[PDB]
Amino acid sequence: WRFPARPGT
Amino acid sequence: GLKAAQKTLFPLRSIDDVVRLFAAELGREEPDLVLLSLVLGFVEHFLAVNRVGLTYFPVADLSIIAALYARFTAQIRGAVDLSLYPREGGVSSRELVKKVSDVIWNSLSRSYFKDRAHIQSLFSFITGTKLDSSGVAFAVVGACQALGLRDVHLALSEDHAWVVFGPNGEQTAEVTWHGKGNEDRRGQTVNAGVAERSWLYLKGSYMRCDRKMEVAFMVCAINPSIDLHTDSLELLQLQQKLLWLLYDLGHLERYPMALGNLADLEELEPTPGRPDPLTLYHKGIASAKTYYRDEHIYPYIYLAGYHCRNRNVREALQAWADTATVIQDYNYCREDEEIYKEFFEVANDVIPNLLKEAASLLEAGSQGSALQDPECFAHLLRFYDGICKWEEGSPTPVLHVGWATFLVQSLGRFEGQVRQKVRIVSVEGPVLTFQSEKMKGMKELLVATKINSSAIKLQLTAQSQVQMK
């Protein structure tokens, strides 16, 4: 799960 | 709720029709966050979640979108009686904000996986009764706009979301959860977290959105993922076009992470006549320096990742050193684990694999190698220095012996003749000044032909003894 606009994958 | 002028573009039959809707809303006194999130969620559902029957674009009919809109406004207006919470001065009260947060919270499914993709939008909240962490914060702000609460706005750090409100917009309130297995603080200010100098609250240098920046957030929240191997081209295109619209109107000026996201999208599929990815990464760093005291980490991690992907070792090392130079002035606190993981992976996986390839290429006769450039060795040292300084004063340690073998191996990738050319000076050629006590004590170990592995380990960690036998 990635916080919006966090870099990388 | 929906005004006649908001309805004239429907049905939306293409990406460009969605863009036109966003342009129209951004031209209004306030863009309608509920409308826009419902539209994005609808098209994401039919482009990423369920593509059965797709032939071009999932047409968004007014009847469908208006009924979703009605479901949301009915559920907020029915549950939040504004008469119980009088507003002086166009300012909302903490009790009112907490009531809206409770309404959203209490609507959610009892049990669900909170880390899933595609649960960020009001379409997910209405159709699935599911939201992710930051999606709850957004939904609270969209509910407050629907109620006429013009002072309630989204606040964003690099890993969390809350709201600002009240007289002069100076109040803060938690409205969602953060992470896994942390204790809820809904209703409280963010002042303890600011005061403790954690990364999570950016020493107070967090983003306070206006409504246009709230639109930018929902655009950054688009998730083009279909599965682990496959992205929706349609949703990538949509996100990229919407970010350029926001950029041209000025609404990314104060949003570093959105600028990095747009740079990433341009690298994947460049738009003719637009700035290069590097220009955009540097604009993101400039935004953080201008508006946020140069206290943000991800503008530098965006840049470093671009250099890493392009096997620019020198510039990747420089950008990671610059990353560390930001973190050094924070205290590592209990809910900062995401940025710990980012530094750990860089030190203990990404840099090692970069230097291993560089070593093979040097063996094959590469010229201008990072491994022969003392300025590159100095960047590596500055990266570790910032991490060590970060640890000083922190309530929880950062370094452990699991870091030390990677440090020794990375140092060793540079020959002694290269390492000797960096002059470490105390407060010609590269000059470096260490801020951390750990690196200052490390200095005399850094120029020997064969690094004293054991001594390095002792200096990097709390360990002060060697084995008894």
Numbering used by the authors:
A (entry chain B): 7 to 15
B (entry chain A): 2 to 53, 74 to 386, 399 to 460, 547 to 588
Paper text:
pmcMenin, a 67 kDa protein encoded by the MEN1 (Multiple Endocrine Neoplasia 1) gene, is a chromatin adaptor protein that interacts with MLL1 (Mixed Lineage Leukemia 1, also known as KMT2A) to regulate the expression of multiple genes, including HOXA cluster genes. Menin has been identified as an essential oncogenic co-factor of MLL1 fusion proteins found in acute leukemia patients. MBM1 binds to the central cavity of menin, utilizing Phe9, Pro10, and Pro13 as energetic hotspots, which occupy well-defined hydrophobic pockets, and positively charged arginine residues (Arg8 and Arg12) that are involved in electrostatic interactions with the negatively charged binding site on menin. Importantly, recent clinical studies found emerging resistance to Revumenib treatment and patient relapse as a result of somatic mutations in MEN1, leading to point mutations of T349M, M327I/V, and G331R/D. Understanding how these mutations affect menin structure as well as the interaction with MLL1 and current menin inhibitors will be crucial in the development of a new generation of inhibitors maintaining their activity against menin mutants.
To understand how these mutations affect the interaction with MLL1, we tested the binding affinity of wild-type menin (meninWT) and four of the most common drug-resistant mutants, M327I (meninM327I), T349M (meninT349M), G331D (meninG331D), and G331R (meninG331R), with different MLL1 fragments. Further structural analysis revealed that point mutations in menin occur in a site that is adjacent to the MLL1 MBM1 binding but has no direct contact or clash with MLL1. The M327I mutation replaces the side chain of methionine with the branched isoleucine comprising a Cγ2 methyl located 3.6 Å from the Pro13 side chain of MBM1, supporting no steric clash with the mutant. Since both M327I and T349M mutations do not change the charge around the MBM1 binding site and do not introduce steric clashes, these mutations have no impact on the affinity of MBM1 to menin. Interestingly, the M327I mutation has no effect on the affinity of MLL1 binding. We found that the binding affinity (Kd) of MLL1160 to meninWT and all four menin variants ranges between 0.5 to 2.6 nM, indicating that all these mutants maintain very strong binding to MLL1. Recent studies found that one of the most frequent mutations, M327I, impairs the activity of Revumenib through a direct steric clash between I327 and the inhibitor. However, activity against menin mutants is significantly reduced, from 5-fold for G331R to over 100-fold for M327I.
